Design a protein around this ligand. Sequence first.
Ligand SMILES: NC(=O)c1ccc[n+]([C@@H]2O[C@H](COP(=O)([O-])OP(=O)(O)OC[C@H]3O[C@@H](n4cnc5c(N)ncnc54)[C@H](O)[C@@H]3O)[C@@H](O)[C@H]2O)c1
Ligand SMILES: NC(=O)c1ccc[n+]([C@@H]2O[C@H](COP(=O)([O-])OP(=O)(O)OC[C@H]3O[C@@H](n4cnc5c(N)ncnc54)[C@H](O)[C@@H]3O)[C@@H](O)[C@H]2O)c1
Ligand SMILES: CC(=O)N[C@H]1[C@@H](OP(=O)(O)OP(=O)(O)OC[C@H]2O[C@@H](n3ccc(=O)[nH]c3=O)[C@H](O)[C@@H]2O)O[C@H](CO)[C@H](O)[C@@H]1O
Ligand SMILES: CC(=O)N[C@H]1[C@@H](OP(=O)(O)OP(=O)(O)OC[C@H]2O[C@@H](n3ccc(=O)[nH]c3=O)[C@H](O)[C@@H]2O)O[C@H](CO)[C@H](O)[C@@H]1O
Lengths: 341, 341
Amino acid sequence: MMSRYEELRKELPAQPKVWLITGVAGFIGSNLLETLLKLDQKVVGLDNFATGHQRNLDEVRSLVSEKQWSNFKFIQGDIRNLDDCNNACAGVDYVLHQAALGSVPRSINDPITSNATNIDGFLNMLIAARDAKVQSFTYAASSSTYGDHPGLPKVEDTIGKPLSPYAVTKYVNELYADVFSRCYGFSTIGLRYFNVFGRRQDPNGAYAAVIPKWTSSMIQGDDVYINGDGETSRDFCYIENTVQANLLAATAGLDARNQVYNIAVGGRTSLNQLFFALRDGLAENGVSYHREPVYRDFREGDVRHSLADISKAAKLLGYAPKYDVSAGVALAMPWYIMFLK
Amino acid sequence: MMSRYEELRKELPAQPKVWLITGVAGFIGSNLLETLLKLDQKVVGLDNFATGHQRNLDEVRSLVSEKQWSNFKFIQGDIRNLDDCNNACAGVDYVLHQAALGSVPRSINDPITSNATNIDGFLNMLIAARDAKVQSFTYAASSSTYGDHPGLPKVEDTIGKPLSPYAVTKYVNELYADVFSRCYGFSTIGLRYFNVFGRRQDPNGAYAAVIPKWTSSMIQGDDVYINGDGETSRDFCYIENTVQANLLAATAGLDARNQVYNIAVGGRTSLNQLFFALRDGLAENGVSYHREPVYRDFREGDVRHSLADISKAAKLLGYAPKYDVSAGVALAMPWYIMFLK
Ligand SMILES: NC(=O)c1ccc[n+]([C@@H]2O[C@H](COP(=O)([O-])OP(=O)(O)OC[C@H]3O[C@@H](n4cnc5c(N)ncnc54)[C@H](O)[C@@H]3O)[C@@H](O)[C@H]2O)c1
Ligand SMILES: NC(=O)c1ccc[n+]([C@@H]2O[C@H](COP(=O)([O-])OP(=O)(O)OC[C@H]3O[C@@H](n4cnc5c(N)ncnc54)[C@H](O)[C@@H]3O)[C@@H](O)[C@H]2O)c1
Ligand SMILES: CC(=O)N[C@H]1[C@@H](OP(=O)(O)OP(=O)(O)OC[C@H]2O[C@@H](n3ccc(=O)[nH]c3=O)[C@H](O)[C@@H]2O)O[C@H](CO)[C@H](O)[C@@H]1O
Ligand SMILES: CC(=O)N[C@H]1[C@@H](OP(=O)(O)OP(=O)(O)OC[C@H]2O[C@@H](n3ccc(=O)[nH]c3=O)[C@H](O)[C@@H]2O)O[C@H](CO)[C@H](O)[C@@H]1O
């Protein structure tokens, strides 16, 4: 019949809970906010606007009812400040930890800054969440943890060596998560995301993800750069799939806890395919682009192939993504067109 | 004929180099200082006295010649401060990074503080050392990285799951070390120490290591507590063996770099044996103690058995420890007796 998520969507409004989203002003966080507020949940948000934007919070407000927006409490704070974490975790049922500094290149140029937020900040949240006695703690892990390991698809128990400072930080989140369960009995669920994309993923900045970067470049008629031969591949995961995984993990049974899960679709998309997918998607919306991609050197700290086996999440969480890359692109292009209008 | 270390001992005085010891006011650091100054080397030290002591620096000065002490430059600073790291690494050839907050129990009671120094501080040193273009970087890793893994003896490529926040931090030192080699070409050598002991290992404080704690307790006639059944075992490594490993790693060839090595003796000593070893050792020095040990609960985050396979260090570094536990105890007891006199 209906998937577990579909069933959860029906239950939540009937029995509202209090959720905390760190990094709520960012891409994934603001999308979680939109979903939760639309499900009539109470939400507390924490963000320092390091890479997030007030415009994202303004967009969510423009998308939800006036009543739903009143169920949102925002705290401008930093996860590196234990006091901000304590305040954000007060009276919270479920914590969805998304606050972090993404981008592999960024961590290569400045590992110290990425370390402070991604590791120190993560640890403070675990402590604050633990001390606040929350019901569940879900955090954003990363598929980059598979590192150099060549096999495909990727399975949770088999990982490789980290190729970047960023990859180390996300892996360390998993390490501390496991130790907090062993030493304090504080269970958590780590979600190893696989290149998430969709509305509100920042197209600006020197560290913009490939889809936002390429989409904006095409819309503007600028050259599009491919790092390497374009055969590099990813399991692009449309934001809706990731939102489902979070709500599912936040309400999962005991058996599914203290586990890390691949969150993706199980699809293989080379950068070369992506270029044409985005270009054809934009043309579909009346945006023409006739330039060929400009190939350059491979990017440092970059993983070659990334394809996820989502069986574990499917079995233990009842995870069932409904959005493939094309459908996600079809939904995303109009947003970027409007964003740069 | 003579081991590589013995040969190194002869070469160093003939061609003095500049060494940096972080955590120089502590147990291992102050012993490295004594050795290096006696080998007519130039030494820069960095310490914040968080757990270290000025008395340790005063003791070293009382043990080396006036000329040798003048080859020592001490900087009271914190590795969590990148500026202190930069200043300490200036014009240095070899870095021996010992600055950290040990103790598994301490990390359980306060993981945040241990994380800040052990991880953030470690990262700053890697950056500063890299930016200073040092010739070699050697750091103190930990045998606790083997965690829950049961097999014996322990081999470097096979580790288990961390049992404490402290164990995570030391493992993370290894993770960043490897990534700095891959991303910046900055080679390092990690030394997984196995319960080091000897003169100047602090007997005071709620987090004192077992040997200093027990020795002082016996000398004072207080009860001695064994956490568990006393069958828990360790590869106690007398400080001289660890000093050798550091100097060896600091001057090792290219092939031996970007490698982590077990540093111990390959001996198995149960806590029950240790109790009598220390008691008989003290009696040997005219200190009688007739109390039986008082057994209590196992300590949280504690590893059960720890025995090292030192073949890798022996083969690649030419590591050749000459001090077994008994010899180490015979050398250590007189120090503690004098310390509490
Ligand atoms: N985007 C992906 O494909 C992907 C994949 C794996 C993991 N992740 C993880 O998902 C999380 C969110 O990523 P995103 O794609 O929405 O990026 P994003 O930069 O748009 O969101 C990150 C948000 O966290 C905030 N933040 C950063 N440091 C903070 C701090 N120290 N205190 C408080 N707030 C802070 C930023 O302001 C930003 O709003 C990150 O943890 C990231 O590592 C993302
Ligand atoms: N003692 C062992 O058996 C053992 C085993 C494995 C690893 N180690 C490692 O060896 C190193 C030294 O341990 P030790 O036994 O000599 O303990 P110790 O506490 O006597 O020495 C640690 C020294 O580092 C200093 N320090 C701590 N944080 C600092 C900071 N943030 N900035 C500057 N200085 C700081 C302390 O003041 C202290 O002098 C540690 O890295 C420890 O993790 C020790
Ligand atoms: C498999 C993997 O490790 N992915 C992780 C990595 O994202 P990724 O670094 O894989 O995502 P990204 O969108 O920044 O890059 C995707 C691919 O597109 C390439 N590219 C990018 C921009 C451009 O102009 N041209 C171009 O070719 C880039 O080199 C990479 O090969 O880090 C992210 C955090 O930021 C997440 O943790 C992802 O899970
Ligand atoms: C194998 C392992 O993981 N060892 C690491 C761990 O040291 P250890 O925690 O193994 O060293 P420790 O001297 O603090 O304890 C040694 C053993 O003696 C026990 N004990 C201690 C005090 C007492 O009064 N009674 C008693 O029984 C204690 O429970 C432990 O089983 O952390 C150290 C840093 O501090 C180093 O990283 C060691 O490599």
